[PDB]
Amino acid sequence: IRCIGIGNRDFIEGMSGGTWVDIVLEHGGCVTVMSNNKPTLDFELVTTTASNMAEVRSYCYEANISEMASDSRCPTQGEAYLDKMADSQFVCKRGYVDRGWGNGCGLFGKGSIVTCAKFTCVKKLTGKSIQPENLEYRVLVSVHASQHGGMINNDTNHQHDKENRARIDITASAPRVEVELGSFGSISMECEPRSGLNFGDLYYLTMNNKHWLVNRDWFHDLSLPWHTGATSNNHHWNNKEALVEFREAHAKKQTAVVLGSQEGAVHAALAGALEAESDGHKATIYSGHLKCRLKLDKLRLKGMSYALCTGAFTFARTPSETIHGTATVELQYAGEDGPCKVPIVITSDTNSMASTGRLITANPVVTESGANSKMMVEIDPPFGDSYIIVGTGTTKITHHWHRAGSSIGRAFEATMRGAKRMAVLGDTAWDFGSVGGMFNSVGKFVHQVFGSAFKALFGGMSWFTQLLIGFLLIWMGLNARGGTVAMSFMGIGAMLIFLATSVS
Amino acid sequence: VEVTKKGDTYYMFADKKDAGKVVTFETESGPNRCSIQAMDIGHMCPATMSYECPVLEPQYEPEDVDCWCNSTAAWIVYGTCTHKTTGETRRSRRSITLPSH
Amino acid sequence: SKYLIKVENWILRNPGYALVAAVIGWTLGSSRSQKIIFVTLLMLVAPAYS
Ligand SMILES: *[C@@H]1O[C@H](CO)[C@@H](O)[C@H](O)[C@H]1NC(C)=O
């Protein structure tokens, strides 16, 4: 039920006998996977986690100085000298100043003056690199089990039945994971962290308990003291003169000063930069998509063997409508019959009693055996006007529903979305290894690209007329000596035969 | 002010209070009267400015010099900070700018 | 708008009878556009028998 209130929602349907199915997850969207006999699953990607990041370089914005010393020699004495010059922690500058009898010595010429002082970095910022083997994605999996649909369980402490929700950590070390959903069964997932945001031109900047991402060509352009990442208590710095300003000159001395906090300059420069969050030493990124392949072999239903409900069904409120034309129904059941299957039908008139639409939640059932219980289901009403009927006998309830749009419009939109999805799955779509899975792959993707329109167009899914239409089209394409008329017709005929062979 | 000698050279630890007054001490040559005209002198704290100030003949006026003694050249040292708050002046106002992106 | 969706859903519900009526009305026009008008007549009267 985690995929109901999401703007970017897709719909993926696989072949009836097709166990494997590929999907793509975006960091701002969701994926709904449905089948004929399997329960509906909902996949979402929550956060990109970066951990164990190496350090590349560290800058020092605010610094201090101490123990300023100077030494002056006038002409006919050579260059000035100081013992602190050889130390890497003391920075000095040389210069030439005019001297005379007023300064101590006789010859009228300019001398050599040197001035150095200590350098201690009180505050600093750091830069880290990001490697693909460090990334770890987190995907939540929900199951449409006719849950109550109440948003009272935000965290992972409780109110989360372990057979209805699960969390999966996809790592670059082991991309193959086995998910256990309890009574529902087990699934397999193989996700490939590819085609994401490039991490070869990005640096993770940590500064004052805040974090940003910067460009590598810009990180080295900054003019501030720096030093690489070396584990030690005292580090050697380079290019610290950019933070220590020396005065013009003096006949006997030179007084240096240190610049103030450059935090404001960095905050102003990083205005148009991307931001992130961090916990301890780990970082969280909200950008990046993922490609996955699911194997659904041991997944089954939970209430397929249950009986029917002989109690009283009632609506709890007016059924709402989502942006994708889907209708959520919240039912309240009275009676004590235990877990029983919910008899619900969708038709065009109260006397017709003919299924006209499909259900997003397979096998709607009541979860508890209480007297007055509640449940929820999600369905897809047909375009136009429709009637939802719940129950049998003289106690069955009916409700009117309307939905705008056109079937051809939805079919074309779904076809274009499926084509875009198959285009995103450029690599790792087919297998060129052992033979026997190539025909399976071509059938699988032609299904995933054309079934949304096949189900919407070809009548009432009789599965008998469509085979005859395909056969007659194959015959019409066969008895044709002209070029470019037999190949396309035979291809369309085989496509229709296969699409009717799959689930409708 | 404190007067010491470390390695045949005289150091004069002068605090903030002795600012603008002369002081007499003793060297191997004899008595030495040394005047201090430090204008930017501060209180005692780790930030210590130290510079040698030279001997000169009394028949010449000081030019761009704020320390002078007459026995030899004497090394002066004094702290530079404000109100003993353990903080340097750091009043540079360079305002270095960084590229945006 | 109000009637197009209804007749579209009707056509998609039972396409066999609709195609039968269309091919019947196709051969009952004197001109091509006249055949189109004759089949659209059946298309319009299709939802309500009355
Ligand atoms: C330095 O000058 C003072 C000024 O009177 C004098 O008393 C002192 O003897 C001089 N020091 C010498 C000559 O070593």
Question: Which domain CATH number covers B46?
Answer: 2.60.260.50
- Cα distances (Å, whole numbers) of residue A455 to A212, A411, A415, B97: 48, 9, 11, 63
For the record, the structure tokens of A58 come out as 């560290």
Instruction: Give A319's DSSP letter.
Output: P
Chain A residues whose CB is inside 8 A of the C14 CB are: 459-460
- The residues that bridge with B67 in the sheet, in sequence order, are B36
Nominal resolution (angstroms): 3.8
- Tokens 């001398």 belong to residue: A111
What topology is assigned to A307-403 in CATH?
Immunoglobulin-like (2.60.40)
Amino acid letter for position A68 = M
- The residues that bridge with A139 in the sheet, in sequence order, are A45, A168
Domain containing residue B24:
2-79
For the record, the structure tokens of A139 come out as 């995907």
For chain B, the residues whose C-beta falls within 8 A of a C-beta of chain A are: 40, 46-56, 60-67, 73, 80, 88-92, 94-101
Closest CA to B49 of A248, A285, A254: A254
**Among B33, B53, B57, B72, which is best to mutate for testing ligand 1, by the most ligand atoms less than 8 A from CB?**
B33
Distance of CA A339 to the CA centre of its chain: 37
Consecutive H or E run containing C13: helix C4-13
| Residue B13 in domain | yes
Chain B residues whose CB is inside 8 A of the A62 CB are: none
Which residues 6+ apart lie within 8 Å of A286 measured at CB? A27, A47, A48, A276
Instruction: Give A153's DSSP letter.
Output: -
- For B77, the closest chain A residue by CA position comes to A69
Please report the sign of the dihedral spanned by the C-alpha atoms of residue C24, residue C28, residue C29, residue C34: negative
- Cα distances (Å, whole numbers) of residue A5 to A92, A138, A327: 64, 20, 12
Name which of B49, B52, B67 is nearest A255 (Cβ-Cβ). B49
User: How far is it, in rounded angstroms, from Cα A360 to Cα A40?
Assistant: 7
The total of other beta-carbon atoms located within 10 Å of residue A153's CB is 12
Which residues 6+ apart lie within 8 Å of B67 measured at CB? A252, B34, B35, B36, B37, B38, B51, B53, B74, B76
Closest CA to A321 of A410, A381, A365: A381
Question: Using an 8 Å Cβ cutoff, are B1 and B12 in contact?
Answer: yes
Question: Using an 8 Å Cβ cutoff, are A170 and A45 in contact?
Answer: no
User: How far is it, in rounded angstroms, from Cα A387 to Cα A344?
Assistant: 11
Please report the sign of the dihedral spanned by the C-alpha atoms of residue A292, residue A456, residue C16, residue A352: positive
Amino acid letter for position A54 = A
B31 lines ligand 1 (CB under 6 A): yes
- Tokens 């026009």 belong to residue: C29
- Three-state secondary-structure class, residue B34: strand
- Three-state secondary-structure class, residue A239: coil
Instruction: Give A54's DSSP letter.
Output: P
Closest CA to A249 of A119, A112, A118, A117: A112
Name which of A356, A384, A457 is nearest C5 (Cβ-Cβ). A384
Consecutive H or E run containing A441: helix A438-457
End-to-end CA distance of chain A: 24
User: How far is it, in rounded angstroms, from Cα A91 to Cα A119?
Assistant: 7
User: How far is it, in rounded angstroms, from Cα A293 to Cα A24?
Assistant: 9
Residue closest via CA to ligand 1's atom 11 equals: B32
User: How far is it, in rounded angstroms, from Cα A430 to Cα A470?
Assistant: 26
CA A168-A170-A171 angle, to 5 degrees, is 145
Amino acid letter for position A3 = C
Q: Sheet holding A20-25: strands in order across?
A: A20-25, A290-295, A186-192, A176-180
Please report the sign of the dihedral spanned by the C-alpha atoms of residue B53, residue B77, residue B40, residue B35: negative
| Residue C13 in domain | yes
| Residue B64 in domain | yes
Which residues 6+ apart lie within 8 Å of A68 measured at CB? A115, A116, A117, A255, A256, B47, B48, B49, B50, B80
- The residues that bridge with A113 in the sheet, in sequence order, are A72, A95
- Tokens 């009541």 belong to residue: A366
The total of other beta-carbon atoms located within 10 Å of residue A355's CB is 13
Method used experimentally:
cryo-EM
- Cα-Cα-Cα-Cα torsion A295, A298, A300, A305, nearest 10 degrees, comes to 160
Q: Which CATH number fits the domain that encloses residue C33?
A: 1.10.8.970
Question: Using an 8 Å Cβ cutoff, are A379 and A341 in contact?
Answer: no
- Would the CB atoms of B63 and A100 count as touching at under 8 Å? yes
- Tokens 């006249």 belong to residue: C34
- Three-state secondary-structure class, residue A291: strand
User: How far is it, in rounded angstroms, from Cα C9 to Cα A399?
Assistant: 20
Provide the domain count of chain C. 1
Q: How far apart are the CA of B33 and the centre of ligand 1, in A?
A: 6
Closest CA to A180 of A167, A197, A198, A193: A167
The total of other beta-carbon atoms located within 10 Å of residue A109's CB is 13
Closest CA to C49 of C35, C32, C14, C23: C14
| Residue B88 in domain | no
Q: Is A66 exposed, middle or buried (0-12, 13-18, 19+ CB in 10 A)?
A: middle
CA A75-A80-A86 angle, to 5 degrees, is 165
Nearest atom in ligand 1 to B30's CA = 14
Pairing state of beta strands A344-347 and A384-390? antiparallel
Pairing state of beta strands A384-390 and A397-403? antiparallel
Instruction: Give A83's DSSP letter.
Output: G
Amino acid letter for position A243 = L
- The residues that bridge with A374 in the sheet, in sequence order, are A332
User: How far is it, in rounded angstroms, from Cα A104 to Cα B56?
Assistant: 5
User: How far is it, in rounded angstroms, from Cα A89 to Cα A342?
Assistant: 79
Distance of CA A276 to the CA centre of its chain: 14
